[PDB]
Amino acid sequence: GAMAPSYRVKRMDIAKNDEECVVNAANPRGLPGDGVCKAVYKKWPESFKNSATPVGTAKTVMCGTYPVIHAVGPNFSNYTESEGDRELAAAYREVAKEVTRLGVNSVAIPLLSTGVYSGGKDRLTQSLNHLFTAMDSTDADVVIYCRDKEWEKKISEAIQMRT
Ligand SMILES: [Cl-]
Ligand SMILES: [Cl-]
Ligand SMILES: [Cl-]
């Protein structure tokens, strides 16, 4: 584990992370997709062999010795608010299990279901709070990747508030 497990946020491409593994905001079919998923496909295309997995789950595939954890958040266009919230919490609990199993000291993670899968809502707080619920009991350094300067400020404030 990390000597003093921490949360950090960076505003940059998760495909250029400095962590021991990456979480893909995957689709259930293992397709190249859009946004984070397309950047991950360009960087680690070998990780998409048999990566298909249902909503609410995470499946790890190695690119060389570098683990790619394919985590499938719900598309809120399709799910009810209630069912979508349950599957979003579940996807992050499966990420915590995979990070633990791999024995990594650090992980790069995007906010699941906040892009094309957001159903056109701002889900920063909802997604981040489920990320914390899952990852708080792990001892990996977590580095959250976002693209919007105002999201960076809001995520940074939420981390600092817990101290
Ligand atoms: Cl960048
Ligand atoms: Cl998304
Ligand atoms: Cl963002």
State the distance from the centre of ligand 1 to the C-alpha of 82, rounded, in angstroms. Answer: 34
The secondary structure of 44-100 as a DSSP string is -GGGGTT----TT-EEEEEETTEEEEEE----TTTS-HHHHHHHHHHHHHHHHHHHH
State the distance from the centre of ligand 3 to the C-alpha of 146, rounded, in angstroms. Answer: 4
Q: What does the alpha-carbon distance between residue 111 and residue 124 come to, in Å, rounded to a whole number?
A: 7
22, 68 Cβ separation under 8 angstroms: yes
Number of domains in the chain: 1
Q: What does the alpha-carbon distance between residue 105 and residue 101 come to, in Å, rounded to a whole number?
A: 11
Q: What does the alpha-carbon distance between residue 6 and residue 117 come to, in Å, rounded to a whole number?
A: 27
11, 149 Cβ separation under 8 angstroms: yes
* Among 116, 111, 142, CA closest to 129: 111
Q: Reported resolution in A? A: 1.5
Q: Tell me the two tokens of residue 100.
A: 């633990």
User: What radius of gyration do the chain's Cα atoms show?
Assistant: 14
**Which ligand minimizes its atom distance to the CA of 12?**
1
State the distance from the centre of ligand 1 to the C-alpha of 37, rounded, in angstroms. Answer: 15
What domain range is 109 assigned to? 1-163
* Among 36, 52, 142, CA closest to 92: 142
**Which ligand minimizes its atom distance to the CA of 127?**
2
